[PDB]
Protein backbone atom coordinates (compact mmCIF):
# COMPACT_ATOMS: atom_id res chain seq x y z
CA UNK A 1 0.00 0.00 0.00
CA UNK A 2 2.70 2.22 0.74
CA UNK A 3 3.42 2.23 -3.33
CA UNK A 4 -0.01 4.42 -3.53
CA UNK A 5 0.20 7.93 -3.53
CA UNK A 6 -0.24 9.75 -0.40
CA UNK A 7 0.12 6.58 2.04
CA UNK A 8 2.59 6.26 4.49
CA UNK A 9 3.23 3.34 6.85
CA UNK A 10 0.85 4.89 9.30
CA UNK A 11 -1.92 5.19 7.03
CA UNK A 12 -1.30 1.47 5.55
CA UNK A 13 -1.71 0.20 9.24
CA UNK A 14 -5.60 1.90 9.24
CA UNK A 15 -5.80 0.60 5.71
CA UNK A 16 -4.89 -3.24 6.03
CA UNK A 17 -7.13 -2.94 9.50
CA UNK A 18 -10.43 -1.90 7.56
CA UNK A 19 -10.05 -4.63 5.24
CA UNK A 20 -8.73 -2.22 2.27
CA UNK A 21 -5.43 -4.47 1.47
CA UNK A 22 -5.32 -4.80 -2.56
CA UNK A 23 -5.27 -1.82 -4.99
CA UNK A 24 -8.42 -2.49 -6.66
CA UNK A 25 -10.81 -2.13 -3.65
CA UNK A 26 -8.66 1.25 -2.52
CA UNK A 27 -9.29 2.04 -6.52
CA UNK A 28 -12.68 1.26 -6.74
CA UNK A 29 -13.59 2.96 -3.20
CA UNK A 30 -15.34 6.05 -2.66
CA UNK A 31 -13.94 9.01 -0.43
CA UNK A 32 -16.81 8.49 2.23
CA UNK A 33 -15.33 4.51 2.44
CA UNK A 34 -11.75 5.68 3.27
CA UNK A 35 -12.29 8.81 5.22
CA UNK A 36 -15.02 7.00 7.59
CA UNK A 37 -11.46 5.17 8.32
CA UNK A 38 -10.13 7.73 10.81
CA UNK A 39 -6.98 9.95 10.41
CA UNK A 40 -7.52 9.26 6.60
CA UNK A 41 -8.00 12.98 5.39
CA UNK A 42 -10.74 13.22 1.71
CA UNK A 43 -6.94 15.06 0.55
CA UNK A 44 -5.28 12.12 1.39
CA UNK A 45 -8.36 9.27 0.43
CA UNK A 46 -8.51 10.57 -3.19
CA UNK A 47 -5.11 10.92 -3.53
CA UNK A 48 -4.72 7.06 -2.93
CA UNK A 49 -7.45 6.54 -5.12
CA UNK A 50 -6.32 8.29 -7.62
CA UNK A 51 -3.22 6.61 -7.45
CA UNK A 52 -4.82 3.55 -6.71
CA UNK A 53 -6.53 3.56 -10.26
CA UNK A 54 -3.29 4.27 -12.10
CA UNK A 55 -1.58 1.40 -10.84
CA UNK A 56 -4.25 -0.63 -12.39
CA UNK A 57 -4.97 1.13 -15.69
CA UNK A 58 -8.21 2.14 -14.66
CA UNK A 59 -8.91 4.26 -17.92
CA UNK A 60 -10.23 4.34 -20.93
CA UNK A 61 -9.45 1.86 -23.85
CA UNK A 62 -9.97 0.97 -27.34
CA UNK A 63 -8.99 -1.16 -29.75
CA UNK A 64 -8.11 -4.58 -29.20
CA UNK A 65 -7.87 -4.03 -25.76
CA UNK A 66 -11.07 -4.47 -25.44
CA UNK A 67 -11.22 -8.06 -26.16
CA UNK A 68 -8.56 -8.62 -23.10
CA UNK A 69 -10.90 -7.37 -20.78
CA UNK A 70 -13.37 -9.57 -22.07
CA UNK A 71 -10.65 -12.56 -21.81
CA UNK A 72 -10.35 -12.55 -18.18
CA UNK A 73 -13.48 -14.35 -18.04
CA UNK A 74 -13.64 -17.86 -17.55
CA UNK A 75 -16.27 -20.35 -17.59
CA UNK A 76 -17.79 -23.26 -15.60
CA UNK A 77 -19.27 -26.05 -17.57
CA UNK A 78 -22.68 -27.65 -16.18
CA UNK A 79 -21.93 -31.31 -17.05
CA UNK A 80 -24.89 -30.37 -19.44
CA UNK A 81 -24.17 -30.34 -22.55
CA UNK A 82 -26.69 -28.45 -24.35
CA UNK A 83 -26.85 -26.08 -21.21
CA UNK A 84 -23.30 -24.77 -22.00
CA UNK A 85 -23.89 -24.56 -24.98
CA UNK A 86 -26.62 -22.00 -24.62
CA UNK A 87 -24.66 -20.31 -21.98
CA UNK A 88 -21.77 -20.01 -24.80
CA UNK A 89 -19.54 -22.05 -23.40
CA UNK A 90 -20.51 -22.55 -19.64
CA UNK A 91 -21.50 -20.50 -16.27
CA UNK A 92 -19.52 -16.80 -16.78
CA UNK A 93 -17.71 -15.61 -14.01
CA UNK A 94 -17.63 -11.87 -13.47
CA UNK A 95 -21.30 -12.13 -13.51
CA UNK A 96 -24.39 -13.40 -11.87
CA UNK A 97 -26.35 -16.16 -13.36
CA UNK A 98 -29.21 -16.83 -11.92
CA UNK A 99 -31.63 -19.86 -12.21
CA UNK A 100 -35.42 -19.40 -11.90
CA UNK A 101 -37.58 -22.43 -11.13
CA UNK A 102 -40.92 -24.31 -10.24
CA UNK A 103 -40.55 -26.25 -6.85
CA UNK A 104 -38.48 -29.28 -7.67
CA UNK A 105 -36.86 -28.02 -10.97
CA UNK A 106 -33.39 -28.76 -9.88
CA UNK A 107 -32.22 -25.62 -8.88
CA UNK A 108 -30.37 -26.67 -5.62
CA UNK A 109 -28.91 -29.72 -7.86
CA UNK A 110 -27.46 -27.47 -10.15
CA UNK A 111 -25.86 -25.37 -7.39
CA UNK A 112 -24.14 -28.40 -6.31
CA UNK A 113 -22.97 -29.96 -9.77
CA UNK A 114 -21.81 -26.77 -9.75
CA UNK A 115 -19.36 -26.81 -6.78
CA UNK A 116 -18.37 -30.70 -7.35
CA UNK A 117 -17.91 -29.22 -11.46
CA UNK A 118 -15.43 -26.74 -9.55
CA UNK A 119 -13.04 -29.54 -8.38
CA UNK A 120 -12.59 -30.37 -12.07
CA UNK A 121 -10.06 -28.58 -13.36
CA UNK A 122 -11.30 -29.68 -16.96
CA UNK A 123 -14.72 -27.67 -16.32
CA UNK A 124 -12.80 -24.67 -16.01
CA UNK A 125 -12.72 -23.24 -20.02
CA UNK A 126 -10.71 -20.18 -20.19
CA UNK A 127 -8.12 -18.20 -22.26
CA UNK A 128 -4.70 -19.39 -21.01
CA UNK A 129 -3.34 -16.38 -22.81
CA UNK A 130 -5.25 -13.92 -20.54
CA UNK A 131 -6.49 -16.22 -17.17
CA UNK A 132 -2.84 -18.05 -16.02
CA UNK A 133 -3.00 -21.71 -14.28
CA UNK A 134 -2.22 -20.04 -11.11
CA UNK A 135 -5.49 -17.67 -10.69
CA UNK A 136 -7.86 -20.51 -11.31
CA UNK A 137 -5.67 -22.91 -8.49
CA UNK A 138 -6.95 -24.90 -5.62
CA UNK A 139 -10.22 -23.12 -6.48
CA UNK A 140 -13.08 -23.01 -3.81
CA UNK A 141 -16.34 -22.24 -3.38
CA UNK A 142 -18.42 -20.57 -1.21
CA UNK A 143 -22.52 -21.81 -0.52
CA UNK A 144 -24.54 -19.56 1.11
CA UNK A 145 -27.38 -21.51 2.14
CA UNK A 146 -31.19 -20.27 3.11
CA UNK A 147 -33.36 -23.13 2.41
CA UNK A 148 -31.46 -25.57 4.76
CA UNK A 149 -31.16 -28.16 1.34
CA UNK A 150 -27.30 -28.17 1.14
CA UNK A 151 -26.35 -31.83 1.20
CA UNK A 152 -22.85 -32.90 1.60
CA UNK A 153 -24.11 -36.82 0.68
CA UNK A 154 -25.23 -35.26 -2.41
CA UNK A 155 -21.60 -34.01 -3.27
CA UNK A 156 -19.89 -37.34 -2.85
CA UNK A 157 -22.28 -39.00 -4.78
CA UNK A 158 -22.29 -36.18 -7.93
CA UNK A 159 -18.33 -36.00 -7.09
CA UNK A 160 -18.03 -40.12 -7.40
CA UNK A 161 -19.56 -40.57 -10.90
CA UNK A 162 -17.26 -37.48 -12.05
CA UNK A 163 -14.33 -39.29 -10.92
CA UNK A 164 -13.64 -36.26 -8.70
CA UNK A 165 -13.09 -37.24 -5.05
CA UNK A 166 -16.27 -36.51 -2.93
CA UNK A 167 -14.29 -35.14 0.28
CA UNK A 168 -11.93 -32.67 -1.64
CA UNK A 169 -15.03 -30.95 -2.94
CA UNK A 170 -15.75 -30.94 0.58
CA UNK A 171 -12.66 -29.69 1.72
CA UNK A 172 -12.78 -26.93 -0.73
CA UNK A 173 -16.30 -25.28 -0.79
CA UNK A 174 -17.40 -23.30 2.28
CA UNK A 175 -21.06 -23.79 3.49
CA UNK A 176 -22.94 -21.26 5.10
CA UNK A 177 -26.66 -21.32 6.69
CA UNK A 178 -28.44 -18.57 6.49
CA UNK A 179 -31.75 -17.84 8.10
CA UNK A 180 -32.20 -14.49 7.27
CA UNK A 181 -31.74 -11.71 4.56
CA UNK A 182 -29.79 -10.09 7.19
CA UNK A 183 -27.28 -12.95 7.32
CA UNK A 184 -27.21 -14.08 3.69
CA UNK A 185 -26.17 -10.53 2.78
CA UNK A 186 -23.41 -10.43 5.75
CA UNK A 187 -22.02 -13.71 4.85
CA UNK A 188 -22.10 -12.44 0.95
CA UNK A 189 -19.97 -9.37 2.43
CA UNK A 190 -17.34 -11.59 4.27
CA UNK A 191 -16.39 -13.34 1.07
CA UNK A 192 -14.01 -10.95 0.53
CA UNK A 193 -12.60 -12.01 4.01
CA UNK A 194 -12.34 -15.79 2.81
CA UNK A 195 -9.99 -14.30 -0.18
CA UNK A 196 -7.77 -12.01 2.07
CA UNK A 197 -7.39 -15.27 4.00
CA UNK A 198 -5.83 -17.18 1.19
CA UNK A 199 -8.50 -18.48 -0.25
CA UNK A 200 -9.32 -18.57 -4.10
CA UNK A 201 -12.81 -18.25 -3.93
CA UNK A 202 -13.88 -18.83 -7.50
CA UNK A 203 -17.55 -19.73 -6.85
CA UNK A 204 -20.08 -18.51 -5.03
CA UNK A 205 -23.65 -19.77 -4.53
CA UNK A 206 -26.70 -18.08 -3.10
CA UNK A 207 -29.76 -20.90 -2.60
CA UNK A 208 -32.29 -19.03 -2.03
CA UNK A 209 -31.89 -15.55 -3.40
CA UNK A 210 -35.12 -14.48 -2.76
CA UNK A 211 -36.76 -17.10 -0.05
CA UNK A 212 -35.82 -14.79 2.97
CA UNK A 213 -37.18 -10.79 1.20
CA UNK A 214 -40.11 -12.47 0.03
CA UNK A 215 -40.47 -14.07 3.88
CA UNK A 216 -39.46 -10.64 5.70
CA UNK A 217 -41.58 -8.17 3.13
CA UNK A 218 -44.11 -10.02 2.85
CA UNK A 219 -46.50 -6.80 3.70
CA UNK A 220 -46.61 -5.55 0.03
CA UNK A 221 -46.60 -2.10 1.77
CA UNK A 222 -42.71 -1.73 2.65
CA UNK A 223 -41.69 -3.06 -0.77
CA UNK A 224 -39.83 -0.23 -1.56
CA UNK A 225 -37.09 -1.38 1.84
CA UNK A 226 -37.30 -5.12 0.37
CA UNK A 227 -36.14 -4.16 -3.32
CA UNK A 228 -33.55 -0.80 -2.09
CA UNK A 229 -32.26 -4.22 0.31
CA UNK A 230 -32.03 -6.70 -2.70
CA UNK A 231 -30.81 -4.41 -4.60
CA UNK A 232 -27.80 -3.54 -2.69
CA UNK A 233 -27.00 -7.02 -2.11
CA UNK A 234 -27.10 -7.90 -6.12
CA UNK A 235 -24.04 -4.94 -6.42
CA UNK A 236 -22.19 -6.30 -3.65
CA UNK A 237 -22.98 -10.04 -5.96
CA UNK A 238 -21.91 -8.43 -8.70
CA UNK A 239 -18.61 -6.66 -7.56
CA UNK A 240 -17.30 -9.80 -5.93
CA UNK A 241 -18.00 -11.08 -9.32
CA UNK A 242 -15.74 -8.96 -10.83
CA UNK A 243 -12.85 -7.98 -8.77
CA UNK A 244 -12.22 -11.79 -8.02
CA UNK A 245 -13.01 -12.81 -11.20
CA UNK A 246 -15.56 -15.58 -9.76
CA UNK A 247 -18.98 -17.15 -11.24
CA UNK A 248 -21.53 -16.68 -8.76
CA UNK A 249 -24.60 -18.43 -9.30
CA UNK A 250 -28.30 -17.65 -7.50
CA UNK A 251 -31.58 -19.37 -7.22
CA UNK A 252 -34.94 -17.93 -7.50
CA UNK A 253 -38.57 -19.94 -6.90
CA UNK A 254 -40.72 -19.02 -8.89
CA UNK A 255 -44.41 -20.57 -10.45
CA UNK A 256 -38.05 -7.82 -9.82
CA UNK A 257 -34.55 -7.50 -9.12
CA UNK A 258 -30.67 -7.44 -11.06
CA UNK A 259 -29.07 -11.03 -12.50
CA UNK A 260 -26.76 -11.10 -15.64
CA UNK A 261 -28.34 -13.95 -16.63
CA UNK A 262 -31.81 -15.57 -16.25
CA UNK A 263 -32.77 -18.93 -16.32
CA UNK A 264 -36.22 -20.36 -15.61
CA UNK A 265 -35.98 -24.30 -15.49
CA UNK A 266 -39.14 -26.81 -15.22
CA UNK A 267 -39.83 -30.60 -14.80
CA UNK A 268 -39.78 -32.50 -17.85
CA UNK A 269 -40.60 -35.97 -17.99
CA UNK A 270 -39.27 -38.26 -15.29
CA UNK A 271 -35.40 -37.05 -15.57
CA UNK A 272 -35.77 -34.20 -18.14
CA UNK A 273 -35.08 -30.92 -17.18
CA UNK A 274 -36.10 -27.98 -19.45
CA UNK A 275 -33.91 -24.92 -18.61
CA UNK A 276 -34.85 -21.92 -20.49
CA UNK A 277 -32.32 -19.01 -21.20
CA UNK A 278 -34.78 -16.16 -21.03
CA UNK A 279 -31.95 -12.97 -20.61
CA UNK A 280 -28.46 -11.86 -21.04
CA UNK A 281 -26.25 -9.59 -22.07
CA UNK A 282 -25.05 -10.96 -25.27
CA UNK A 283 -26.55 -13.89 -26.29
CA UNK A 284 -30.00 -15.18 -27.43
CA UNK A 285 -32.73 -16.48 -25.56
CA UNK A 286 -32.64 -20.32 -26.12
CA UNK A 287 -33.89 -23.43 -24.48
CA UNK A 288 -31.19 -26.33 -23.23
CA UNK A 289 -32.72 -30.06 -22.60
CA UNK A 290 -30.89 -31.98 -19.64
CA UNK A 291 -31.57 -34.35 -17.02
CA UNK A 292 -31.01 -35.25 -13.22
CA UNK A 293 -29.81 -38.72 -12.01
CA UNK A 294 -28.02 -40.22 -9.42
CA UNK A 295 -24.89 -38.18 -11.22
CA UNK A 296 -25.76 -35.18 -10.93
CA UNK A 297 -26.83 -33.21 -14.03
CA UNK A 298 -25.99 -35.00 -17.47
CA UNK A 299 -26.20 -35.39 -21.24
N1 LIG B 1 -29.50 -38.75 -5.28
C1 LIG B 1 -30.36 -38.45 -6.29
N2 LIG B 1 -30.55 -39.34 -7.36
C2 LIG B 1 -31.45 -39.04 -8.42
N3 LIG B 1 -32.16 -37.89 -8.43
C3 LIG B 1 -31.93 -37.02 -7.32
C4 LIG B 1 -31.06 -37.27 -6.28
N4 LIG B 1 -31.11 -36.22 -5.42
C5 LIG B 1 -31.95 -35.35 -5.87
N5 LIG B 1 -32.50 -35.81 -7.08
C6 LIG B 1 -33.43 -35.19 -7.84
O1 LIG B 1 -33.49 -33.80 -7.46
C7 LIG B 1 -34.92 -33.42 -7.32
C8 LIG B 1 -35.03 -32.39 -6.48
O2 LIG B 1 -33.98 -31.38 -6.86
P1 LIG B 1 -33.94 -29.88 -6.21
O3 LIG B 1 -32.58 -29.24 -6.57
O4 LIG B 1 -34.09 -29.95 -4.74
O5 LIG B 1 -35.13 -28.99 -6.86
P2 LIG B 1 -35.46 -27.52 -6.30
O6 LIG B 1 -35.83 -26.66 -7.42
O7 LIG B 1 -34.26 -26.95 -5.61
N6 LIG B 1 -36.66 -27.66 -5.29
P3 LIG B 1 -37.13 -26.44 -4.26
O8 LIG B 1 -35.93 -25.76 -3.67
O9 LIG B 1 -37.92 -27.01 -3.18
O10 LIG B 1 -37.93 -25.50 -4.98
C9 LIG B 1 -35.54 -34.70 -6.73
O11 LIG B 1 -36.90 -34.67 -6.53
C10 LIG B 1 -34.77 -35.84 -7.45
O12 LIG B 1 -35.51 -36.19 -8.75
K1 LIG C 1 3.31 6.62 -0.88
K1 LIG D 1 -38.18 -35.44 -8.75
K1 LIG E 1 -29.52 -9.12 -17.52
MG1 LIG F 1 -19.74 -8.30 -13.95
MG1 LIG G 1 -34.07 -26.08 -3.78
Redesign the pocket.
Known sequence: LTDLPGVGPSTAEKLVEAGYIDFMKIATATVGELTDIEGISEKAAAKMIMGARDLCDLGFKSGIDLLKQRSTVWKLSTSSSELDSVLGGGLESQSVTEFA????????????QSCVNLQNPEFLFYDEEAVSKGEVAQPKAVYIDT?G?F?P??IM?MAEHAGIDGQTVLDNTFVARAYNSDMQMLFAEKIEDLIQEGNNIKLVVI??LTSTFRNEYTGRGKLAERQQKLGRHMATLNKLADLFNCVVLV?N?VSGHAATFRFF?RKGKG?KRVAKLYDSPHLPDAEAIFR?????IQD
Open positions: GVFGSGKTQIMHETRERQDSTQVDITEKG
